[PDB]
């Protein structure tokens, strides 16, 4: 229910949301400035007398026309190789981002990643890729726990003259007694001998308490 | 449908010019889209509107399987009609 409510919620935001994608729009604006400046160079003197050699040719002589063209052509030979330098520093930023996106899909789409915030912020679930005209976006699915609620813990408990430690779990008390839930939900069952392990006594720990550990082993008797 | 050097009532340029349906202001003669590239002009004789179009062009790339497979080769006219050969 919450999975598809969240999909509908991305629906309604993305049909309404502005400035979400703005970055690919920047990149097209950004190439577009590049070439528009390149054009507005080709109609530019670069320190020449005119921006057009054709009028030169139709009114001037070979030597002066060709020196003016020499300075004209030097100007355009920068403007081009400058543009090429511009583009391949764009393309370097792209190639970095592309390795990063390939890794992103490898780890979030093609696998389950423990990396923190590498597949979006929150406890990782999942990611759905979703292409763009010049890009692709991953719809990252991630888990958020809720309703925290405060109890007191104990690393182990003094029993049989032993500190019986959680094999995989934690011991909490609500106010008076002592349930075994897991670390990152309230998923309780009852603290028992079969769901916690002993290693040594309880005469060194700080924070241990006296109490019993249930053991379903006498009732085998009857 | 010809890339040609044109001089219309003293206005000279080179390229392929065709008809345009555009309407210039009665005083307005010739048109450049963004980038200052002429797109249409008002006729010197008739002051009708005629489209200025880019002198056709294209790339030239040659396509091979490598020599040692063959001396054979495919050829591409590049964003170009092969009517223009």
């Amino acid at each position: 229910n919450q999975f598809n409510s969240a999909i509908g919620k991305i629906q309604d935001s993305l049909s309404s949301t502005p400035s979400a994608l703005g970055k690919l729009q920047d990149v097209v604006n950004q190439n577009a400035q590049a070439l528009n400046t390149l054009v507005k160079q080709l109609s530019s003197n670069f320190g020449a007398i005119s921006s057009v050699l054709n009028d030169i040719l139709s009114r001037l002589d070979p030597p002066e026309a060709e020196v003016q063209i020499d300075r004209l052509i030097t100007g355009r030979l920068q403007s081009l190789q400058t543009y090429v330098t511009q583009q391949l520093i764009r393309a370097a930023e792209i190639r970095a981002s592309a390795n990063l996106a390939a890794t992103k899909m490898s780890e979030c789409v093609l696998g389950q990643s423990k990396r923190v915030d590498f597949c979006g912020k929150g406890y990782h679930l999942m990611s759905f890729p979703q292409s763009a005209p010049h890009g692709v976006v991953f719809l990252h699915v991630t888990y958020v726990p809720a309703q925290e609620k405060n109890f007191t813990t104990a690393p182990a408990i003094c029993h049989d003259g032993k500190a019986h430690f959680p094999r995989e779990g934690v011991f909490v008390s609500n106010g008076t007694h002592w349930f075994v839930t897991q670390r990152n939900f309230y998923e309780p069952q009852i603290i028992t001998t079969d769901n916690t392990f002993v290693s040594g006594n309880c005469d060194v720990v700080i924070g241990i308490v006296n109490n019993t550990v249930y053991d379903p082993l006498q009732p085998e008797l009857d | 449908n010809k890339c040609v050097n044109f001089n219309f009532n003293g206005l000279t340029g080179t390229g392929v010019l065709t008809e345009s349906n555009k309407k210039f202001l009665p005083f307005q003669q010739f048109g450049r889209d963004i980038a200052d590239t002429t797109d249409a002009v008002r006729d010197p004789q008739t002051l009708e509107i005629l489209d200025i179009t880019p002198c056709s062009f294209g790339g030239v790339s040659v396509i091979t399987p490598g020599t040692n497979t063959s001396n054979q080769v495919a050829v591409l006219y590049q964003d170009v009609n092969c009517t223009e050969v």
Partner: peptide, 23 residues
Amino acid sequence: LFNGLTVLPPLLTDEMIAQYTSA
């Protein structure tokens, strides 16, 4: 979203990227 300068069309048309994404 000219002058003897042009831009090539993307190698992988959205139809490709679409059923690559679908697979």
